[PDB]
């Protein structure tokens, strides 16, 4: 076992990695890091060896409950959603949620998002510069869909976008706020499921609903859990991309312009995107070896945690050409952005979605768009990218 290293690695600002993930990649054998909680681990950095971790099912989820996993967060909720588990209960849970994700299913939000993305531009026109990319624009769009989707009142969303940070919050100053406002949107979530069982509606919540009562598909702790996973997922992630893809189009202007003029290329490039634009402060959720494995040159043994790091893996030059270059019309671009294997992103074509569209309105209404300030990055979350991002144009 070599020295671990301590990690998350950062930096916290723009889009670069640290140049110990570079160094991790290139060498032989895996690495060890050592996070603020739980066990050391093993890192994996290269897409061969990132793409046997997550995809090869001699790792484990579900079997990180006989640990105390390596974290960036104290509380470690182990919330009963598919994430969390393996085959068969995994699979149990995903099939259920999964319809309401699919491309063929959220294909007809398009002219919803589009509609919506362009409301939002009218207002920061209609305000004047300068606009904050993120609260005018980046963070309503997918927090609408998602609780249009799940069932989950907009109105709501500056109560569940304060719990949201601070379970996302991975500062040791006030190293409880996690676990007790995880709490708080327990309860709130708890009163919507109460709601729809009283009356239900065209929302997802009421869909598992009927999958618990009628089918008996699934617990209630379950239902409770993939209801907090999918909002914040649902939300979060998109919401930090879309200034973070921004970002990396306005400082690299070239790809900024070639969109403008080719804005048929946007799918390519959303892909590309996804790749070069890191979501995670930090690797993947750790996978424990279920019996010793061979892993990018090292003995894995049986117990033992890998940790992914989905950006380096993302960067490796043995996979991707020229990999610390956007090139926006990059073929065969099966990056990790969205993970691979069993618990690939359910959310992936809405995200997809999202991301073009949201683009495609920029690009069509505000060319000339700039950064018109100082751009907060998040710090200390388990998210990366800007928190407000000022604009003008
Ligand atoms: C830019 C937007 C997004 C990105 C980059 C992203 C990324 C990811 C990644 C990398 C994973 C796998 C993590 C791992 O294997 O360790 C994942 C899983 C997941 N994501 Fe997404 N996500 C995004 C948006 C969404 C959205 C909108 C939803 C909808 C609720 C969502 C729901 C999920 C779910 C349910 C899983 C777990 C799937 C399973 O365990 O089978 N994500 N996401
Ligand atoms: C519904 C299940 C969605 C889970 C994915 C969300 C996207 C992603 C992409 C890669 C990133 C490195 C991580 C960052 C972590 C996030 C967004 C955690 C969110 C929060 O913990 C949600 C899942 C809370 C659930 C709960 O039950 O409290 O997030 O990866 C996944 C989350 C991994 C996590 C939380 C690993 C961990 O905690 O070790």
């Known amino acids: 076992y070599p020295e671990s290293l301590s990690y998350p690695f950062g930096p916290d600002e723009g889009l670069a990695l640290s140049e110990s993930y570079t160094r991790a990649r290139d060498t032989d054998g895996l690495i060890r890091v050592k996070l603020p909680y739980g066990e050391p681990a093993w890192l994996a950095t290269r897409y061969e060896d990132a793409r046997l971790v997550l995809g090869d099912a001699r790792f484990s989820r579900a079997l990180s409950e006989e640990h105390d996993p390596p974290r960036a967060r104290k509380f470690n909720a182990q919330a009963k959603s598919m994430f969390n588990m393996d085959a068969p209960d995994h699979t149990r849970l995903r099939r259920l949620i999964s319809k309401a994700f699919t491309i063929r299913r959220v294909e007809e939000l398009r002219p919803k998002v589009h509609d ?183 003995l894995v043994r049986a117990g033992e945690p890998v940790l992914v790091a989905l950006g380096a893996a993302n960067r490796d030059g043995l996979r991707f050409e020229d990999p610390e270059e956007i090139k926006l019309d990059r073929p065969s671009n099966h990056h990790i952005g969205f993970g691979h294997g069993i618990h690939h992103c359910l959310g992936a074509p809405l995200a997809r979605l999202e991301l073009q569209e949201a683009l495609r309105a920029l690009l069509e209404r505000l060319p000339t768009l700039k950064v018109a300030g100082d751009i907060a990055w998040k710090s200390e979350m388990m998210v990366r990218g800007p928190r407000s991002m000022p604009v003008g144009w």
């Open 116 to 298: 919506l993305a362009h409301r939002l531009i009218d207002d920061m026109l209609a305000k004047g510069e300068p606009a904050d990319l993120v609260a005018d624009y980046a963070l309503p769009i997918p927090t609408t869909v998602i609780c249009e989707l799940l069932g989950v009142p907009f109105e709501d969303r500056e109560k569940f976008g304060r719990w949201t940070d601070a379970i996302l919050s991975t500062s040791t100053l006030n190293p409880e706020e996690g676990r007790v406002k995880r709490m708080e949107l327990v309860g709130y979530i708890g009163g919507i499921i109460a709601a729809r069982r009283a009356q239900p509606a065209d929302d997802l919540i009421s869909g598992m609903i009927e999958a618990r009562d009628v089918q008996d598909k699934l617990t209630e702790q379950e239902l409770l859990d993939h209801c907090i996973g999918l909002l914040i997922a649902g939300h979060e992630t998109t919401a930090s991309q879309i200034p973070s893809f921004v970002y990396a189009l306005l400082d690299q202007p070239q790809h900024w312009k070639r969109l403008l003029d080719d804005p048929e290329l946007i799918p390519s490039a959303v892909e590309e995107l996804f790749r070069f634009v890191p979501l995670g402060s930090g690797s993947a959720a750790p996978r424990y070896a279920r019996e010793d494995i061979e892993v990018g040159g090292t």
